[PDB]
């Protein structure tokens, strides 16, 4: 029960030493133990996420309403998660950073990953978002540009402000993000202090086939808690893991983090009475013109056994919608679905759904067969094994009725590659620029100062048009704090920094 | 029940229509069921075996009698599987060709795989042999080499005598070989009336710690029955998949192949008595000097459910081996065991002992961890998770107490780089070739005068100076089929040849 | 020069002996060239392909006219390889079949592979195409239902014609192709006496940023030849590589093949005139009513030096598109797109595109890093090598100015999963039918006769109403085929095969 | 030359907008543009070396004195780099931590990595070692152990002092790598200034076939810096790739950083006047009895163009030696040859030895084929092709002939599972603790006090057992560290630490 054993089921007598012509001889081939061993520790290593490398999973349960805000869930969307009052569903979160890999300091400035697995009896839904309520660009074509501009330099390996900036001189939409970003709402304290977002813009469909646009928010009972760069560097001195640490070890004692999920309604259609699109993710709904209505409440209260074969292995996607969840026109939104069955499949493996931690809670039958680590097949009970096919007259897999009439949202215009007609780069990081606190400000003033010091002045002055346009105090105070920080960086010594206590040689 | 979902378990209501603006419109993004459907297509394939890659699959049981010949089989070896009369052990076997691809046609010219997996209460026994008794080469190295003049050539695509016998005529060791694979004995009628040898030298470990040289072979309780080279021709006219078909249908109708195992003993030494060397898998054991010893019986009663699941991800490794079996200092042994976890790795995956089909059917407890596509881990009921190491004074697995000496043989000589002091390649390839049939001998030098004609001569003088050496007829036979078959070839046309039915455009 | 060395460069003295504890000792874990040499044997076999397996590949030149027709080229489209008269493009072209994998016969029935790649100055353009004008669906979703009925069983390994048409009975759109492909059609008796076609629909732009329906079309010189199944059996006796052999063999002795490109114009539009739908792959373009236009001639005149490198490694995708060139609205075409990518990273590599044969012959400027052997770095001379992004002040590629106006069509419709609105299914299956030789049609009727011959009944009715639909005739033979076949089958016994000649043990 | 194209060659247009039906609607499969951007983007990341993940990389040069010591180098060894004075030998080195991942803050406690290549005429030499003369085992058998108690717990995700020396508790033979590592040896302050050593014993081989014990080391000109755990926490505070900066900056700014080569040469044989065995790494040879003789130096004098293509895919291996050099009994050294072609295949990979940073320097001439990703065929000048494989009359690469004797040293002895006669694992553990410099002590007892201060008795008793049979005064300073920290521990309240500042909600 509790013999050492290799993978073949051989039962190891010896677990220190290797097979030896001698015992100070040489290594022979006649040591299956050893290789084995040896061969499986050599392949444990899978490539990280290309995006949100470092991260923290936490197993729960949410729990529906019955209805939206103060009425009925079936006046908008289907989704037999959200029908019953009370009605429990299963879930994994995987919360995570965004530039760094693995290991990295979880004190670092970065958007935060907030991803919800919610296991349905209409298959599995992941809602992918951020802690932000928006991202840096509008198309995703954008995407591998500003993460290689975000990410550690090819030169380097050392992430750099002005490589940052410099597609932020050419990316003007960024400039709410960024607004955020160097705020200390940049640096969550924790995940469980932290607030979530779908941040792209989706669609709800009901019983008529109706469809609305949505958007989606987690709101922590917890509170929310952000860390300012002061205090950031200060935890990073004695603890690169104190968000990983923070939300294992509360679960651990049982204080069992919750979020409350909130929800945007909006009616489907262009919307010109507004100076900005509801398709954009560059763009928040303000409140005051669109209320959040209350959908239900998610509970983590369990951690996973192992880190590796669960939080590690867990994938998540765009497109994996059930019934009663659509996709919208969001240009960003269907971009990503296409990439992350496409990076799965190569990082987490070909049949990456056939995982636990992956797999759904229920019924599963295709004709999909095959791939590599394949460890069972989707047939049913009874089938005729040699259909894997459909349609079929012999057996196999049948199409499901329509219960409700599908969503068939009418689309007109011409295939063309143009940005949408109401960018509006400027107009809400404004808002949010004066919405903020005293102390908020400061701090944002404090890190683009800092951060746009020593960078070339072209970006800098095209950084500096993008604040004004949003503020002018925004622009004039970054300037001044650009200013005064090269002047004294011209007023120091900029030597080759010296580490550490000299010593010598113990031989 | 039957209802056709996606892997993530959403029922599909339309297998049919990718969703399109329009009927006859572009199809989006918002393709989820399209995605995942053809995202896991794409990579149904995983790298064919880089040898015996064409094979089929079947389950079965093993009985042993509790004895070898006829006295005790714990006096030689203490393999729990053969203790106990009438002790049964499940067992799958894979049978296999050896040079051309997967859907090759398996009327070709090859030796054939019979690797047997022995699923037995001290985990699991591979053993990975073949129909015939001996080999091409002696020593592991040789084999890159081997295969790639055996293989299709890399500039054509197809296999070349000339090519082949290039290889031979610098590799005298593999005469023996040849003068079997050329003869009836090259092409078996199907699988289930053939023979299988583990044709390396092993070793059996009884209760004294004692170790004797060994050698394994299944004899068909079907009978033997070979196919010649006009015979072969005339199944693959219309049948490329004659000897799959075979095993299959008549384990289908219930006519139950079965095999008898049974194991040549010797004493471990030099033997300086012999003009051949007990570690050479060129070389046979003479009946008359090491009887055959019975040990049991293999019967193979189901077909897999899935080829590729079972058949296809099925992973056989020489080092593979329960307690009371060894190695031998067989050259070519010892380097087989290299290159089975090596590229099983590849070809099957990281974890690929977690398979159903691989893994073994007992407990096991290891401190391997990860890898990607990790169904489970190797921990036991209350083991403290965060240990996965040995030796551990919180938890984790112990190692097995020794109920018996282990086998420790004495080893002496320098470290070279030299083949053994009997080689004598030419010996036994004469005694076999007196030996045979005469049907067995004129289908000998039929094939090797149609191999050997307009190859370059000086590959047929080092060729016909092999097989003068093993016989005087044997090399004379063979010459003067050569020279008739080139002087039939002068006096042709070789024109290109043409093929099918003229015809003319439908449009 | 020509010194046996390792991959690290370290010259071989010893290539036949492994270094052992003497001569007949133990191998050492002191033997990296052993372990280098075989640790990458272990791994020379990559995934086949998932269809299209078993192929063939041949270099060439393509020589345009500079005109379409008698008209100038440039009316239609403004691709730069067309414009000018005998101006001449490197290609690299691969023939296969589809159905099993690679060392399959080619004389099995099957589509044939034709696909094209052209190394012209605005980068590669794939033209992936088959020999047949058509293919069995017109949804792409359907892809992996009819690729699974049309390969071997998951529980036999085997072809079997009832899969196939269990299939087909809920596929009424594949009559038209079955119509071809059981005729002699269906085997071609090599690649130089064969057509070929890119099937799909596709678009050429103009100077204008006009846009028009497109088919292609390659017209061998050598003519068009077919191969009988009575041929195709004898064939297969003695040669399962006859077509490659055949392809090979030719351009080896300077007898190069060539073909001409011919091209099918029609004005964008729905065409309510037409019984069919243009954008539907299972039809065909009357020449009486779109006739066909010369575009040019291309030549295959040099033999790969390495299969594996050049053929085996090809990657063709019909996203693989140059300046002049676009998509249509054709389903099946845009479904097509993403799968190739998908594959290929998988198969070939993530920087697949970065291989001699797949790698365009010119200029190459992209802000793509990193991925799997990656063998060099997308940046240009002078560049500053931290900027891997776009926009960027500081430095990196810029985009390309427009020369001519895109191609930007006009689409409306509702968001909808449904099929075209013209299907018609039977009506130039049936045309094609009455067209067809009298041999041509007796070989139809014979296939079909002993495809359906022990089929499922319900299987069978569907074929037939299908076959009487396009032509009376057509199922009436087909029927008495049927009937006919079944009864000689009831007058006979059918008991296990037997193979091969009854031997005797050697030992 | 710098317009932005695709890897297909396509001048890319318009790199900020996807294409779609109108500037607002969905996303179309006709994104050819977009799909080949993402496709490799969502492949970018390899996984990560399982040890020394964390690292950077110097081209450099090395020169030769032509002699050992004070005489001359052909003496003991033949290894053609070191022959002639001035000789200069292109070499790549790569320093690394050991165990967290990429990313991860180098102010933490490990080893650190010191992989040096070596670009000779006979190929290339991978000298891999580290900083510390010595390692934590002896046997490879228990490196994944090892590594599994240091790295990260599968449950937390973080590194526990607990794990560490659970492991330790019962592996006494770690004791002397523990006095190096909890010293302030265990933290470099950089790589410039820092040791290096090829920790395990080789061998050097001259022109008679005599072979001697060899150790490497690697003294830095910039001399040696170590970094306390008080100036640790410090630097991790805002810098957490102090150690890669500080390299990289100073080859930038001309500070080329300097290492001289030393070798300790021994006579071949047992020794039993020595109370440690030399074959054991978990020793230093004593300088009073092998002195260290002068070899050559080293100069790193230029930085990565590309840090992805040239330091993450760098690959070494132990077995990687040129003529001249050679194994030796070190079943620490035989076991790591074996890992790193193993884990190389699968993270470079198949091909990573025909990647430019891995690739010799000289002619390649192999018979190896095939492989994924594979750019060139090792053939030569006028080869014919079909041939890839040795022995060969028609062509291929032929053996070297050799110029000296190979070293064939005497082995014998029995076949067993047991370690070496002379363990003695306190011994150099105590004579390093006294030699210890008072501040280096007094860093020693403080962090094994912490360390231990908490864990699970079992094993604070049996870690004082080890240091105080090293050195009584070592155990008795640790016991009363560990009982003073566990006091003030017991003086505390463990409530859950409290992050960041409050906020509110911005919407
Ligand atoms: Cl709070
Ligand atoms: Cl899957
Ligand atoms: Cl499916
Ligand atoms: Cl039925
Ligand atoms: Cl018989
Ligand atoms: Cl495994
Ligand atoms: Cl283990
Ligand atoms: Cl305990
Ligand atoms: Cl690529
Ligand atoms: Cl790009
Ligand atoms: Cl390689
Ligand atoms: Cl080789």
Redo the contacts between chains.
Sequence with gaps: ??????????????????????????????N???????????????????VH?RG?GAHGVFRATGKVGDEPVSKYTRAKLFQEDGKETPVFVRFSTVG??????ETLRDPRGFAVKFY?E???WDLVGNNL?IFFIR???????????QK???????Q?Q??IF??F???PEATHMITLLYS??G????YR?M?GSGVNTYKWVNDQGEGVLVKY?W?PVQ??????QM?A??????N???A???L???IE?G?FPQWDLFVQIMEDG?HPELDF?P?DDTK?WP?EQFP?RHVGQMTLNR???????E???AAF?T?????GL??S?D?ML??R???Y???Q????????????IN????????????????????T?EG?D??????????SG??????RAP????????????????RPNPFGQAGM?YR??AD??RDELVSNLSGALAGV?K??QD?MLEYFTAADADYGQRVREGIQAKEAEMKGQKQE??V?????????
Excluded at 346 to 353: E, S, T
Excluded at 406 to 421: D, F, Q, S
């Design positions: 029960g509790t013999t050492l054993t290799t993978r073949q089921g051989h039962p190891v007598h010896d677990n220190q030493n290797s097979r030896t012509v001698g015992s100070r001889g040489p290594m022979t081939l006649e299956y133990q050893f290789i084995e061993k040896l061969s499986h520790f050599d392949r444990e290593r899978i490539p990280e996420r290309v490398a923290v760094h890999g693995t290991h990295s300091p349905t209409d298959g599995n309520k198309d995703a074509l954008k995407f591998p540009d500003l993460i290689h501009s550690p330099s090819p030169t380097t390996n050392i750099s002005e490589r410099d597609f001189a050419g990316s200390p709402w640096i969550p304290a924790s202090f607030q928010h709101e509170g929310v808690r952000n860390l300012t205090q560097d200060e935890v990073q001195a004695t690169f893991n104190h990983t640490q923070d294992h070890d509360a004692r204080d262009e699109d398709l928040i409140r959040w951690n996973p056994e192992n880190v590796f074969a939080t590690e292995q996607g497109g994996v919608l059930v019934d659509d996709f026109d240009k269907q971009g679905t296409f990439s069955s496409d990076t499949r190569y990082r987490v493996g070909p049949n990456y759904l056939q995982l636990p797999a759904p809670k229920k019924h599963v039958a295709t004709n999909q067969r095959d791939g590599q680590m394949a460890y069972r097949v989707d049913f089938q094994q040699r259909v894997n096919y459909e349609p079929s007259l012999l897999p049948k199409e499901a009725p329509r599908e969503h068939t949202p009418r689309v007109e215009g011409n295939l063309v590659r143009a940005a949408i007609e949010q919405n903020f102390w908020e070339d072209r970006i095209k080759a920094p580490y550490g206590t000299e010593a010598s040689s113990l031989y």
